[PDB]
């Protein structure tokens, strides 16, 4: 699994790596050495770069998509050295050496910063990014790029991005480049249908105030008066209208969850046989099929081992399906 389609082997050559796991209680060979681990290149620099090892520099991060892209991020705690200029050598002399030692993998020394914003900006360099957003509750980073440097923005498999999503550990978001790509105003006035029936008496009170969310209504329903002061007129009718809107939101969220858990849409075209019940077909179609046109192509692999079925019942159901689909040829 740590090998590559281009990293190649035959008895006789010397391949190096880092001993990553040792299982002396195993049955046979128990000296497990890997190569795709990031810190590997770190130690490579340790045996090549004189700046590392003496604490004068600090190799912090390493994003390694093996065979695709191997970037390194370092930081200098001293005030008389540079992070990238000293480690590159003399116009790609030692970095290219460690690259051709690793297998000619493209190695670009990136400079991480104390904040994830500049970190992911440099990780996708040299290229422009029109929007950088961080999200903690989603554990993600929205990186919206501009047109003009796409040849360096994505590349193959989005490698210039694939490293960042692999380095920070957060599944980034680089999807859309059209209007409202900033993700800061992409939800301010793009989905206006939030207060469907809230101000039922009139409409001319003041400008809308989105800075609360209008959708949570769990951190907003029952709060002290100092948090609901952003909108004036917090009387009993107003709080009751808010509670009614929160109840409607709860009902809608419950319906959405009930619909999303069952990603099958079980209609009445599913219980025409003898012996088929709700959970049977639920599981059978949650295994990856949709309707009757995609079930006769299987056998005891999928239809067996279901809650409430026996191997003989599975054989019976599969022969009935094959006779109604393969042996009947009707539509």
């Amino acid at each position: 699994e740590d090998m590559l389609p281009r990293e190649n082997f035959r008895p006789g050559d010397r391949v190096r790596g880092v001993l990553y796991s040792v299982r002396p209680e195993a049955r046979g060979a128990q000296l497990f050495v890997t190569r795709s681990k990031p810190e590997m290149l770190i130690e490579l620099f340790r045996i090549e770069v004189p700046e590392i090892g003496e604490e004068v520099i600090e190799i912090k991060a390493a994003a390694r998509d093996p065979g695709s892209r191997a970037k390194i991020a370092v930081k200098t705690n001293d005030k008389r050295i540079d992070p990238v200029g000293a480690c590159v050598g003399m116009r790609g002399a030692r970095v290219q050496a460690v690259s051709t030692e690793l297998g000619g993998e493209r190695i670009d020394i990136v400079l991480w910063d104390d904040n994830p914003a500049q970190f992911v900006i440099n990780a996708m360099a040299p290229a422009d990014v029109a929007s950088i957003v961080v999200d903690e509750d989603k554990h993600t980073m929205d990186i919206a790029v501009e047109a003009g440097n796409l040849a360096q923005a994505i590349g193959r498999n989005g490698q210039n991005v694939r490293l960042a999503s692999q380095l920070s550990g957060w599944e980034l978001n680089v999807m859309t480049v059209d209007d409202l790509q900033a993700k800061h105003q992409a939800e301010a006035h793009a989905a206006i249908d939030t207060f469907t029936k809230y101000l039922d008496i009139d409409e001319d009170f003041a400008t809308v105030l989105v800075e609360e969310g209008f959708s949570t209504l769990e951190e907003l329903a029952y709060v002290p008066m100092k948090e609901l002061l952003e909108i004036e007129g917090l009387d009993e009718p107003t709080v009751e209208a808010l509670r009614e809107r929160a109840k409607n939101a709860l009902a809608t969220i419950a319906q959405a969850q009930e619909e999303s858990l069952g990603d099958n849409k079980p209609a009445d075209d599913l219980l025409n046989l003898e012996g088929v019940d709700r959970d049977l077909a639920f599981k059978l179609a949650a295994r990856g099929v949709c309707t009757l046109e995609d079930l006769a192509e299987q056998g005891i692999d999928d239809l067996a081992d279901i809650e409430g079925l026996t191997d003989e019942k599975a054989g019976a159901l599969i022969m009935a399906a094959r006779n109604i689909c393969w042996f009947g040829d009707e539509a």
Binding site: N8, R10, P11, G12, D13, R14, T100, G104
Partner: protein
């Protein structure tokens, strides 16, 4: 196409070339068969092949030309030469050959030789009527090898002390007697560096037997000359093979009037490998040592000499002692009165972080009058008589303090007066 460009090139350029030639998946096999298939393809689409190497004649009759980087090992990269060349040009084992070669057809797989071009860096006409190695007349060393570079670096002072304790010349035998942990590797490295910087005309050869591979790779690209080494990774058969290879190469080169210089490390390990590789003769001493088992190592150490006709051969083989076993001990006893220049490196000074740890009291060289001048020899004798009453560590630090201030041994001698 020439062979050395594809031999000493990194394997990455070979992978790129093989992928550009539109061939099978090349990076999945050894470097040996990789370059073999590359040469085969370039011959299928191209001109004759140009190869080179060192020749070894088996007991079968034919010959194999092997490259230096593989330590002269068997494989697809070897060059088959028929006995017809060995009858026409009267070839011998260890002949440095370079010439034209052709691809093989069915029944064969090695590149057959077509026409020799350079034999031991010489014309075949001049090499036809020549003089044998053993037929030469040995002599004492007359031209001293200057080991001082003149810059006076932080570590070249080692070499300086060497010039102070063991004047080396073309045709001398050097035995470095040092226990482990003593720091002889960088010593030999600096010796090779200085002898290549001061005497770049003479060929320089090093030999690492039963050595760690990391040192092999770090020495094969730090010093000049082909660094042939047989690490401990392989059995003793490869060790005796490379020993014969290097000794025959040196013999041929000195027969062609070239000053050959061999650096061998260590000689005790080579003799142990010899002992386990050659069949036993029945007689066995303590430590598992045979009688005839030392004959071939002895010969190897005796090959070095100062030829009166032309050129010379200077070997410097280090003897590893103080290991606990009896093999190294009996080897050092058998080789004690063998070399004409011993250099003792006591571990007592090495463990005290005082380098170079050199036992100047027990070191010396015979017939040094034929290597140094009169007043130089007088100053050396005065310094020896002065240092002899001192111990080892104290004398070593005194010499270090007296040599650090000066940059040249001549100013050192005149300031010691």
């Amino acid at each position: 196409m020439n062979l050395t460009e594809l031999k000493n090139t990194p394997v990455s350029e070979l992978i790129t070339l093989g992928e550009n030639m539109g061939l099978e998946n090349l990076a999945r096999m050894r470097k040996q068969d990789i370059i073999f298939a590359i040469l085969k393809q370039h011959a299928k689409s191209g001109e004759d092949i140009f190869g080179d190497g060192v020749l070894e004649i088996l007991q079968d009759g034919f010959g194999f030309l092997r490259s230096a980087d593989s330590s002269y090992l068997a494989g697809p990269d070897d060059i088959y030469v028929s006995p017809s060349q060995i009858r026409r040009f009267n070839l011998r084992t260890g002949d440095t050959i370079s010439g034209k070669i052709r691809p093989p057809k069915e029944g064969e797989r090695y590149f057959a030789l077509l026409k020799v071009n350079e034999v031991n860096f010489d014309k075949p006409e001049n090499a036809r009527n020549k003089i044998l190695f053993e037929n030469l007349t040995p002599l004492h060393a007359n031209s001293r090898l200057r080991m001082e570079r003149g810059n006076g670096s932080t570590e070249d002072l080692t070499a300086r002390v060497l010039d102070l304790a063991s004047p080396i010349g073309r045709g001398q035998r050097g035995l470095i007697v040092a226990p482990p942990k003593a720091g002889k590797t960088m010593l030999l490295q600096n010796i090779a560096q200085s002898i290549a910087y001061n005497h770049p005309d003479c060929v320089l050869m090093v030999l690492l037997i039963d050595e760690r591979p990391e040192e092999v790779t770090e020495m094969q690209r730090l010093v000049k000359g082909e660094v042939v080494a047989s690490t401990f990774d392989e059995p003793a058969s490869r060790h005796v093979q490379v020993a014969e290879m290097v000794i025959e190469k040196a013999k041929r080169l000195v027969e062609h009037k070239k000053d050959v210089i061999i650096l061998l490390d260590s000689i005790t390990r080579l003799a142990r490998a010899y002992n386990t590789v050659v069949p036993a003769s029945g007689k066995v001493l303590t430590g598992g040592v045979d009688a005839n088992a030392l004959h071939r190592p002895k010969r190897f150490f005796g090959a070095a000499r100062n030829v009166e006709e032309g050129g010379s051969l200077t070997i410097i083989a280090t003897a590893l002692i103080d290991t606990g076993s009896k093999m190294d001990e009996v080897i050092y006893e058998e080789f004690k009165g063998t070399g004409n220049m011993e250099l003792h490196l006591s571990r007592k000074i090495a463990e005290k972080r005082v380098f170079p740890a050199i036992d100047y009291n027990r070191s010396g060289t015979r017939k040094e009058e034929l290597l140094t001048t009169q007043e130089e020899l007088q100053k050396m004798w005065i310094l020896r008589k002065i240092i002899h009453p001192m111990g080892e560590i104290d004398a070593m630090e005194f010499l270090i303090n007296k040599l650090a201030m000066t940059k040249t041994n001549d100013d050192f001698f005149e300031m010691m007066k």
